[model samples]
Target: EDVIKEQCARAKVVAELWHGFTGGAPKAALENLVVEFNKAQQGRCVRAQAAENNIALYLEAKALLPIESLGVKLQGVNLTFLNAVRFGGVVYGVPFNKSIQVLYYNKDLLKKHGVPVPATLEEFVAAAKKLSRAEGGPVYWFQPDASTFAYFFFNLGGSYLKDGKLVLNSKEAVEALTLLQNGVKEGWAKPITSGAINQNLGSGPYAFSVDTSAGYTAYLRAAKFDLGVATLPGRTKGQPGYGLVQGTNLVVFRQASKEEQAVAKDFLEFVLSPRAQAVFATATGYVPVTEGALKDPVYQAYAAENPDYATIVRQSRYAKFEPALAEWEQIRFDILGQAIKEAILNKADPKAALDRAQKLAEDLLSS
Candidate 1:
């Protein structure tokens, strides 16, 4: 306590927070928060800057400070968000702009087809089939990306890592891959290989898409039809559904001095505070990270006005994180993405593709 007080009492300190947010609302909201923090803190504060989302660049340069070193309580932030920054039981980052997956469907399309919004994975597939038969066109927009796979695989009871090794070929994984691959083969779902799915969902033939909650504003702007946001389906009805938390996290740098580190800690505290989270979420459509944020008057009023955002908040209750290992980025994109593309696009065997992906991922971990 004395050390912290002394650090805070020292000369002016400026901590540079390098982030990957770009374009429009996300960037603006972050800058706004930084400005708020700076004005609130007066002399010692942070300066927000944009950087490419490459962890290796920072890690190789020995730039990041392990957040555990600060001994911050980090109370009120969701555990799932915290888990995303943990490496070997040590925290190195703090949750800032975080989001989870939610199903976005055209309510008019579903109503016309007499298909109720799906509550389970089986029901979701059935809805796609029924909608295709009624419209005589593709229904679901199958996103051929690892984040999409992670969202589905998680809801289907799959885990990305077990005992510190990649387990991308689990039984649930094969089922999740097969579900989408078969949907494409059966001609009900269309493979969206390139560009934003939101744009495609707006004008194209897709009846529904599972997308990041952070893109809610874009989706609202894009969809011409009645948009209905719902929680991602679980394997069965009455079971708790799951979603993968997706977004950038805040990391203090080792390059900063004691006073600067103190300022960074204060900045993190301010960011996690309820009012700030409410401001960030209301501005960017990103989900708030804290329970207090959900209850904040600003967020509550926003949620009441935008009910779809409530679906996002509800799904966040069961949100999970991808592995925070050094190899996670490579495993998720390069390996898992290939497996998904092969199974869905190239018509390869789902189990075989996943097995190969698991072997390749495990090899990467070994060396």
Candidate 2:
């Protein structure tokens, strides 16, 4: 907290700090708003500061606020803000970085194997099998890590909770796990070394990889094979898969005076403007949240430059925010990842593994 105070002390003015690699217009607008707010509040109150990576700031501000009366505000992009909000925190910023997952395929391999682009889970699995045998080489249809298994489960109409109880032991979860494990066991999928899927995909050894839209620019630029981008294959028609939102938020501390709080709100409002949102979107490949920002001429012009850039934004309607429950942090870190790893590696029975994981999660939630 002292570190945040010290950093704010250096700024000479109280302003909402937006972290991350923002573009020129948004940065300029933020600075301008801070100056205006400080000037307006100069004689009446001290300035408030907003920034990212300063957990101390959040802690200090939260401590000073009237817990029962006044609310603290923070700025976040997409899922990061959603997480905080889910945990009973207040966030007041646009979800600027709405990242959606897409299936990136090797176009050349698909063409050679005569495999049609897969739009459904059944087709996806069949394509995986066919591509795995293309040219009698070891080709992977899908490459997933422990972190992604839950997402896969959700896409298949499963849930982690049911009736306030852990459902990792439910039939839906069992089916999801079975699908994942069977992929590897039946040679439809491959499990790479820890965190190696990116490298493997870049090397053209894998036929398809599920990745964020932001990754498309880099992967398309560097991939050794021709790349194709499409929505994630779904289990049922019109029921698409979900991806996590990738962005942070801006928050106001509780200790800030009424004047500072007002200033923070003004600065936050500035960030939500069409100009700032468009600038941020174009610069970082993160989409803007406001309707005005989405329809802005600037963003539209940029979209014209790259036709595929809009696919993610179009797909984001189905994006799912991680459950905001406080227990989720530990759940994601411990049970979910390990359960998928165990199932994928065939180290344990998929159903039994998820059942145990579910029990642990239920216990944690209960406590």
Candidate 3:
């Protein structure tokens, strides 16, 4: 209360931005974006003032803007990323740079093992078993990243939310993790523990790994083998293969006047425009958010050069975000994570692990 009172003492006049781009490609890109926004404002009283650590900004907005009103606008944003803005039916954020996980494999190793690219979980398992056979050669290095697991979790027809409740222990979820348990039991698969999937895949001992598309350049530079990319396969041929699409997003509650709202809306347009998307995408290795941005001449040439990334762009239509909850991150990383570890490492029963997992998540959500 004191902080809000203190911060609200002044009658604010300028629009402001709060983003998470502290460094790297995001930092350089945003620094210039702020410059561009200000120049475009051209001495308007409603010029944008930018800040960072978006977490703090989001919390502060509650005190600054009433629940029913928005000082800023996001009326013209893209529909594919509409989820980034509204968690429920109400608005909260905006999508900036979307990312999704992909299955990356060593082409040479797969061929050496006489394994064709796996098209389904059955094929994936069979190929993994074959790859594991050759002594001291590459084995199927299992992807341990939570997001990688999430790919399979969704691939098996698991819904993060069903009937307005979290369904972490669904029948589909049990069967999904069972694949890993069996893989580990059979010696065909093991999780990458010593290093990142990219590093391990490049250096040695891994035939296939599923990971994010953002590391396309890193994989190209790191791998000595013939690197191949594929969309994460579905459970069956006709089943939808779901990838989790995500990125930095924009939100607004700063518009105190029509002039200020104008400033906020204009800058919002500027940032989501094809020009801005391309600039950020190129710098940060994040896929652009729009068809026009993806179709740009330079981006197309870049896409031709980097097919791994293009696959992510091409497969983005099937991507999704997990159903939102205040405790979702914890549920995914801890409760669900413990369940997966139990099944995969300790050889615990998949149903028992997930039974406990669903209970834990339900309790957390209720609490």
- Candidate number of the best TM-score: 1
Note the Cα lDDT for every prediction shown: 0.79, 0.61, 0.67
Off by over 4 Å in 1: 1-11, 51-63, 202-204
Worst 10 residues of 2 by lDDT: 66-75
Residues 1-367 of candidate 2 have per-residue lDDT tens digits of: 3433444565544543434335444444334544543444443322334453423234433432322232323322334334423323533333445466777788888887788878787888788888876645445534444346655776777765576555667777778778877777777677775543555554435677777776676777667778887777777767556665555545444556555555555555656667767776787677676667767899889878866677677666566665545466677768876787777765688788877888898788777
Q: Model 3, residue 211: what's the lDDT?
A: 73
lDDT of 3 by residue, 245-264 (tens): 76665555544666556666
Better of 2 and 3 by lDDT: 3
Error of 3 at 194 (Å): 3.4
TM-score, each model?
A: 0.88, 0.77, 0.84
lDDT measured at residue 210 in model 1 versus the true structure, 0 to 100 = 84
List the pairs of residues colliding in candidate 1: none
Highest-scoring model, lDDT: 1
RMSD of 1: 4.5
lDDT of 2: 0.61
